Design an enzyme around this catalytic site. Structure first.
Site, mmCIF file in Angstrom:
data_model
loop_
_atom_site.group_PDB
_atom_site.id
_atom_site.type_symbol
_atom_site.label_atom_id
_atom_site.label_comp_id
_atom_site.label_asym_id
_atom_site.label_seq_id
_atom_site.Cartn_x
_atom_site.Cartn_y
_atom_site.Cartn_z
ATOM 1 N N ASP A 1 12.167 6.034 -22.613
ATOM 2 C CA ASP A 1 11.656 6.434 -21.315
ATOM 3 C C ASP A 1 10.357 5.659 -21.093
ATOM 4 O OD1 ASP A 1 11.488 7.653 -18.837
ATOM 5 O OD2 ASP A 1 11.875 9.695 -19.593
HETATM 6 O O1 LIG Z 1 11.423 5.630 -13.315
HETATM 7 C C1 LIG Z 1 11.898 5.334 -14.624
HETATM 8 C C2 LIG Z 1 11.883 6.585 -15.490
HETATM 9 N N1 LIG Z 1 10.598 7.285 -15.351
HETATM 10 C C3 LIG Z 1 10.486 8.500 -16.171
HETATM 11 C C4 LIG Z 1 11.654 9.456 -15.968
HETATM 12 O O2 LIG Z 1 11.553 10.488 -16.944
HETATM 13 C C5 LIG Z 1 12.997 8.749 -16.069
HETATM 14 O O3 LIG Z 1 14.056 9.643 -15.718
HETATM 15 C C6 LIG Z 1 13.022 7.547 -15.155
HETATM 16 O O4 LIG Z 1 14.252 6.851 -15.309
#
Ligand SMILES: OC[C@H]1NC[C@H](O)[C@@H](O)[C@@H]1O
Ligand SMILES: OC[C@H]1NC[C@H](O)[C@@H](O)[C@@H]1O
Ligand SMILES: OC[C@H]1NC[C@H](O)[C@@H](O)[C@@H]1O
Ligand SMILES: [Mg+2]
Ligand SMILES: [Mg+2]
Ligand SMILES: [Mg+2]
Ligand SMILES: [Mg+2]
Ligand SMILES: [Mg+2]
Lengths: 781, 206, 206
Positions: free
Chosen positions: B65
Site C-alpha cells: 500500500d
Molecule cells: O491510492 C492508492 C492507494 N492509497 C491507499 C489506499 O489504502 C489504497 O486502497 C489505494 O489503492
C-alpha cells in the site's frame, strides 16, 4: 535565466571583537568533540520528533542537550502561559527604538523561561516589496532603515535576555506564492521548483541586504536562509548569498540554519555556507563527506564552532533550563520510547513566564496607533450620551481567542496575523469590551455593539441615535500554508475584509461623528471613504496583541496622544504601489521568475519617483497637539578618508573551485568586520533641528531625517534617521543625529564597495516623507 | 495499529476470500498499512511467505500500500515484490551486490511481476497511458534534457462504451426490499407523489 | 402615494391598454390602491365616472382592490360598484333609504354585475366552488345554527387537462435570443455540457 556566480571557500569565523570570548569558549568545547558529535549540532532531529519547533542533536557525553529552536517573532509559539505581543509592523509604527528593545527583552525572557535556545525571529525578510505580501506584518517596514534600526533593537533585547535571536528570512522571500513547490502544487499550480527572486547587486545592497547588515552588527547569533531562490540558486545553497554577502562582506560570525525543509544541495549546501539543516540523512551524508574528503574537516569544525559561539555569546551556558513545555500537545504528561518499552514523562510544566509583560504590550499597542485623520472626532471623553460600536472587528472570536489554528481565520477582532509568526493569546481584550468598560466606568451613557457586518439595518438604527460611532474594520494575511477566503498567504486584494467598506458607508450615512479604526496587516484602499465628511477621525491600530482593546481606548479617550507614523504608504490604487504579485507561473513547470526590476523603488520611493500623491505618505501621523520645526544646522565632522579593507584571513583551523581551500583568503574591500568595513560607520555630518510643541497637551513627535543622494537613479529622498520625543506644551528640544558614510553612499558593483558619489547631497528634517519642513546641503569634504 | 488475529480465525474468516482470489488467478496482491501480530503486513513473513506464497501458493506479485511501512530491503526477504509509490531501488541493488538479498530473490520479484503481465495478456492489450491523474488539463509542461516540452497529457479517450446499462442493471439488482405492507410497486399514475430528503437531490457543487 | 398624471399622458399611455380591454368586452375592472391626482382610484370620479364610464363607455362593473381606500358611500357615487374584500352593506342600504344614494345608482351597480355574469355565460358554466383558498385539507369544520358541521372543502378537481402543452409552447415562444456568435443551437451530442447557477436547479423547499 538570471545566474548566481559561485564564491568559495566558505569563510570560517574570525572570533574578533565582541565575538572573541564566545569564539574561545566555542573552540574549547568543539575541540573535545568527535566528528559524530560535531555533525549532531548541525542536524535537526526531524519534524515534530521532540518538543520544540526544531531541535538539534545532543551531546550526552558532555551533558549537552540539543538546542531548542522556537517560533515566533512576536512571542513563544505553541506554549501555554505566554504573552501575545504586537506584531513587528506595529513596532515599526512606533518609530521607537526603546520600545523595540523592551519588546525584544520581554520576548527573550519568555523564551528563556520556557527553556528555548533560539527564538526564530525577528524578521527583515520580507522587507515589504509588495503591499499585499502575506508575511510583511511579521517584519517592520518596506523602508530598509526603519526596519534595520528596529530589527537591531529587537535582537539586542532578545539576546540581552539570554536567548539566541535569528534573523530571517535571508533573502528575497518577498511573497508567499511559489515559495515551495509542494505548497504550490497543493494550490493547483504545476511547478517543481520555488520562485527565483532576481535581484541585482545594487538593489540587494541598497535595499534588501541593508537591514540584515544591521542585524549582523547588532550581534545576532543566527540566520535563517529562505525557501525561495535568488538568481536561480536556492538561498540555503547560494554561495554568493551566504559565503560572499553574509559571511565575507557582512562578516557574519554566527550560524546559518535552513528554513524548515528549505531546498539545498545537501552536503553541497555546507560548502556554500549552510551550517544547520532544519528540521532534519544530512547527518550521515555529512559524516561520509568529511571522511571521504568532499567536505573539509575545517568546514564542519567551523559549523560546530559557529553554533557554539552563538550559544556562548548570549550566555546559554548560564540561562539554559530544561524545555518545560511541548509544542505538539497541551497535555501535562505523555509517553516517550526508551531502549526497552516506554517511559511516562512530564511534558508540560505550565511555567507562567508572562510576568508584567502585559504592560509593555499595552504601551506598544498605544504607541503603534497612527492617527491618519481628525476633524474634531478625537479624543473622546467617555461622557458621550450614546456610543455606537460597529463591525465584527470590534467583537470576540466566537471560537475563543485561540480558536483558530495558527490564527488561520478572521474571527472577531484582528490582533495577530496567521502562520508560524504567531503565539497563543493568554486572553484578548476586544474593542467592544474596552469601550463598554470605558463608558460604564465614566459617564455611563448608552452603548451598543453591532458586531455582525451583515446586520446593516441594526447599524443604521444604532448609528442614527449615536453621539459617536466607532467603526472597526480589518484585513488579514499570513504564511502561504494557510488559505483564508482565497488569500493563499498573500492578499488577493487590498480590500477591507467581510464587507468592511459597506459597514463604514452605512454608519457614516447615519452618523456625522464616525470614527474608523483599522486593524490591518498592511495598507488597504480607502479612497472611497477616507474623505467622507461624516468620518471625523481615522486611526490604524495594526495587530496589537493581547491588550488590543485597552491600548486602543487609552488613545481614543485621550490618556495617550497618538504619536505613531504609518510605516508604509497609503495609495489611491493597487497600481500606485507598482507591479502585481507574481501569482501565475511564468517558466512552465520550472522555477517562476520574479524580476525585481523596480530596483530600490518600493513603497514611498515608487510614489516619489512617479510624482503620485499618496492619501497618507510614509512617515505621516497626526497628534492631539501640534509641532513646529526650525533652525536646521549641518556640521561637517572631517572623518578620516575611507580605506577599503585589505589583508588576509587566518588559515582555516581544525579542532566546485575553492570549496575545499582552507588557505588564507583575501578580505573583501567592503568587508573586514561584522556589518561591513567599519569605515562605513564613520560619522560624516552632525545634523540638528529644533522641535517645538505649539499645542495645548503633551505629545510625542517623530522627527525624520531624509537624504537626497542626488543622482539620476537615486530616490528623491531616503529615510536615514528618526526618533520619538515627548514634548510638553511650549517645550522645545534640539534633535541632533549623525549621518554615517554608509548613509550617504551608493553601492558600486564595479569596485564592489560603497562610494560617496559626486552629486550634491541634500539633507531634510520633517514630520513625514512629504512634509520636509527643513533642508540644507551636505557640503562635500 | 496491530490487528491481533489467531491462526484459526485467519484461516476460517479473513484469509478465506483471499484464497478464492489466488485460485481465481489474480495477478497481484497489496499488503496493508496495519500490522498483524505486531509485524507490518508488507514485511510480515508469516503473512506473505507462509500463508500467501506457500499455503495458498500465490504465483503473482505483492505490492505495498502507498507508503505502507516495511523494513526496507528486509521486506523483500519477507515476501514483498514491489514498493509503492516509491531509496528502495538503490538499497535493493546494493543488497544484491552485498549478498544480503540473494540474486534468486530479486529474480523472483521480477518474474512474478512479468508473469502477471503475461497472464492477462498485457503484451497484447497495452496502449499508451492516455490520461493524467493529477490534472484534467489537455496539455502540461514537462522537463526535458534541454529546457521543457509542452506535451499532451490528456487525450480524453471515451471508454464508457455501453457500460451505463450494466450500471443501471446492478443498481436495480442491488436494491433490497426490507419491508412491504402494500407500498410497492408504484404505478406512476399516483395523483400526488411527494419526494423527500437531501438524499433525493443533487450535489449543488456538481 | 398619489400618482400625478396629466390628461395627455393618461390618454396616450396608461389609459390606452385599458381602452383595449373595454373594447374587448372585459366584464370587470379593479380600481387601484394608489391615488391619482390626490384622489383614491376607487373614489376618483374623474377616473371612474368620466374616463372609464363616459369616455371609454365601460358597461361592466368596477370592484375595489382588497381594502383599497375609498369614501364609503361616496365611492358608489364616484363610480365604484363592488367593495372587496368586504359596514358598506349597511351604509349603502341606509344611503338609499335616506336619499343620499339614488335608487338608480344601486340599480346600476347590481345590473352591471349581473350583466358581466350573463355576458360570459356564468348562468351556463357555473359549478359549485370545489376548492378552498385557505387550506389544502379535504374537510373542515363550519359553524351552523346549531353546533357545527364537518364539510368537504376541497374536492381536488383536476382541471389541468392538456394545458402543459400550451405552457411549454408559450415558454419556447417567449425565449428571446439577444446574442449568438455561433453558440446556438446545441445538438445534444456535445462531449461535455456544463450547467451553472442556482437558477438551473431545484427549489430545495419544493
Ligand atoms: O491510492 C492508492 C492507494 N492509497 C491507499 C489506499 O489504502 C489504497 O486502497 C489505494 O489503492
Ligand atoms: O515554524 C518553523 C518555520 N516554518 C517556516 C517559516 O517560513 C519560518 O518562518 C518558521 O520559523
Ligand atoms: O389577492 C387579491 C388582491 N390583493 C391585492 C392585489 O393588489 C390584487 O392584484 C389582488 O387581486
Ligand atoms: Mg512529542
Ligand atoms: Mg520582563
Ligand atoms: Mg571574517
Ligand atoms: Mg509454490
Ligand atoms: Mg354610456
Amino acid at each position: 535565466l538570471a545566474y548566481s556566480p559561485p564564491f568559495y571557500p566558505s569563510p570560517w569565523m574570525d572570533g574578533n571583537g565582541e565575538w572573541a570570548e564566545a569564539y574561545r569558549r566555542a573552540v574549547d568545547f568543539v575541540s573535545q568533540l568527535t566528528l559524530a558529535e560535531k555533525v549532531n549540532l548541525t542536524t535537526g532531529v526531524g519534524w515534530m520528533q521532540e518538543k520544540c519547533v526544531g531541535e538539534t542533536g545532543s551531546i550526552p557525553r558532555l551533558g549537552f542537550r540539543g538546542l531548542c529552536l522556537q517560533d515566533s517573532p512576536l512571542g513563544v509559539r505553541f506554549a501555554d502561559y505566554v504573552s501575545a505581543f504586537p506584531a513587528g509592523v506595529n513596532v515599526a509604527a512606533t518609530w521607537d527604538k526603546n520600545l523595540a528593545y523592551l519588546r525584544g527583552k520581554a520576548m527573550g525572557e519568555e523564551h528563556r523561561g520556557k527553556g528555548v535556545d533560539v527564538q526564530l525571529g525577528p524578521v527583515a525578510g520580507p522587507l515589504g516589496r509588495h503591499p499585499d505580501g502575506g508575511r510583511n506584518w511579521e517584519g517592520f517596514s518596506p523602508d530598509p532603515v526603519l526596519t534595520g534600526v528596529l530589527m537591531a533593537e529587537t535582537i539586542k533585547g532578545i539576546q540581552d535576555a539570554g536567548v539566541i535571536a535569528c534573523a530571517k528570512h535571508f533573502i528575497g522571500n518577498e511573497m508567499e506564492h511559489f515559495r515551495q513547490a509542494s505548497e504550490a502544487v497543493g494550490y493547483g499550480f504545476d511547478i517543481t521548483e520555488s520562485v527565483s527572486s532576481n535581484i541585482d547587486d545594487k538593489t540587494l545592497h541598497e535595499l534588501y541586504l541593508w537591514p540584515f547588515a544591521d542585524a549582523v552588527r547588532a550581534g545576532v547569533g543566527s540566520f535563517m536562509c529562505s525557501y525561495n531562490q535568488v538568481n536561480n540558486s536556492y538561498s540555503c545553497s547560494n554561495s554568493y548569498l551566504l559565503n560572499k554577502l553574509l559571511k565575507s562582506e557582512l562578516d557574519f560570525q554566527g550560524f546559518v540554519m535552513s528554513d524548515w525543509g528549505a531546498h539545498h544541495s545537501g552536503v553541497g549546501a555546507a560548502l556554500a555556507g549552510l551550517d544547520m539543516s532544519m528540521p532534519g540523512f544530512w547527518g550521515t551524508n555529512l559524516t561520509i563527506a568529511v571522511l571521504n574528503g568532499t567536505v573539509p574537516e575545517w568546514r564542519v569544525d567551523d559549523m560546530a564552532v559557529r553554533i557554539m559561539a552563538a550559544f556562548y555569546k548570549v550566555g546559554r551556558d548560564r540561562y539554559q533550563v530544561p524545555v518545560n513545555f511541548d509544542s505538539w500537545t497541551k497535555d501535562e504528561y505523555g509517553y516517550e520510547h526508551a531502549l526497552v518499552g516506554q517511559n511516562y514523562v512530564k511534558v508540560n510544566d505550565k511555567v507562567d513566564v508572562r510576568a508584567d509583560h502585559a504592560d509593555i504590550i499595552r504601551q506598544i499597542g498605544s504607541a503603534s496607533v497612527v492617527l491618519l485623520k481628525n476633524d474634531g472626532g478625537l479624543p473622546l471623553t467617555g461622557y458621550e450620551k450614546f456610543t455606537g460600536v460597529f463591525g465584527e472587528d470590534a467583537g470576540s472570536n466566537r471560537w475563543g481567542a485561540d480558536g483558530c489554528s495558527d490564527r488561520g481565520c478572521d474571527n472577531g477582532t484582528l490582533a495577530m496575523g496567521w502562520g508560524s509568526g504567531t503565539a497563543d493569546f493568554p486572553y484578548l481584550v476586544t474593542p467592544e469590551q474596552a469601550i463598554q468598560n470605558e463608558i460604564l466606568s465614566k459617564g455611563k451613557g448608552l452603548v451598543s455593539a453591532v458586531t455582525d457586518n451583515g446586520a446593516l439595518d441594526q447599524m443604521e438604527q444604532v448609528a442614527s441615535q449615536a453621539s459617536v460611532s466607532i467603526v472597526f474594520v480589518n484585513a488579514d494575511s499570513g504564511e502561504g500554508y494557510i488559505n483564508v477566503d482565497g488569500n493563499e498567504g498573500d492578499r488577493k486584494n487590498l480590500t477591507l475584509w467581510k464587507g468592511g467598506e459597506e459597514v463604514i458607508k452605512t454608519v457614516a450615512a447615519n452618523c456625522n461623528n464616525t470614527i474608523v479604526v483599522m486593524h490591518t496587516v498592511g495598507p488597504v484602499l480607502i479612497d472611497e471613504w477616507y474623505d467622507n465628511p461624516n468620518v471625523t477621525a481615522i486611526v490604524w491600530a495594526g495587530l496589537p496583541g493581547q491588550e488590543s482593546g485597552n491600548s486602543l481606548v487609552d488613545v481614543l479617550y485621550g490618556r495617550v496622544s497618538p504619536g505613531g507614523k504609518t510605516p508604509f504608504t497609503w495609495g489611491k490604487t493597487r497600481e500606485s504601489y507598482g507591479a502585481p504579485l507574481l501569482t501565475k507561473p511564468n517558466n512552465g513547470k520550472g522555477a517562476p521568475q520574479d524580476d525585481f526590476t523596480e530596483g530600490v523603488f518600493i513603497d514611498y520611493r515608487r510614489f516619489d519617483k512617479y510624482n503620485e500623491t499618496p492619501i497618507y505618505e510614509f512617515g505621516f501621523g497626526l497628534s492631539y497637539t501640534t509641532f513646529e520645526y526650525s533652525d536646521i544646522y549641518v556640521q561637517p565632522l572631517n572623518a578620516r578618508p575611507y580605506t577599503p579593507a585589505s589583508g588576509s584571513t587566518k588559515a582555516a583551523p581544525t579542532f566546485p573551485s575553492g570549496a575545499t581551500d582552507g588557505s588564507p583568503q583575501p578580505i573583501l574591500p567592503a568587508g573586514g568586520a561584522p556589518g561591513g568595513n567599519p569605515g562605513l560607520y564613520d560619522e560624516m555630518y552632525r545634523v540638528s533641528a529644533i522641535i517645538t510643541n505649539t499645542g495645548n497637551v503633551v505629545g510625542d513627535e517623530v522627527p525624520q531625517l531624509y537624504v537626497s543622494l542626488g543622482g539620476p537613479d537615486d530616490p528623491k529622498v531616503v529615510l536615514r534617521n528618526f526618533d520619538r520625543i515627548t514634548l510638553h506644551p511650549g517645550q522645545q528640544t534640539m534633535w541632533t543625529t549623525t549621518l554615517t558614510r554608509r548613509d550617504i553612499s551608493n553601492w558600486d558593483p564595479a569596485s564592489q564597495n560603497w562610494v560617496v558619489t559626486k552629486y550634491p547631497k541634500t539633507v531634510y528634517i520633517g514630520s513625514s516623507s512629504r512634509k520636509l519642513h527643513l533642508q540644507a546641503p551636505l557640503p562635500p569634504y
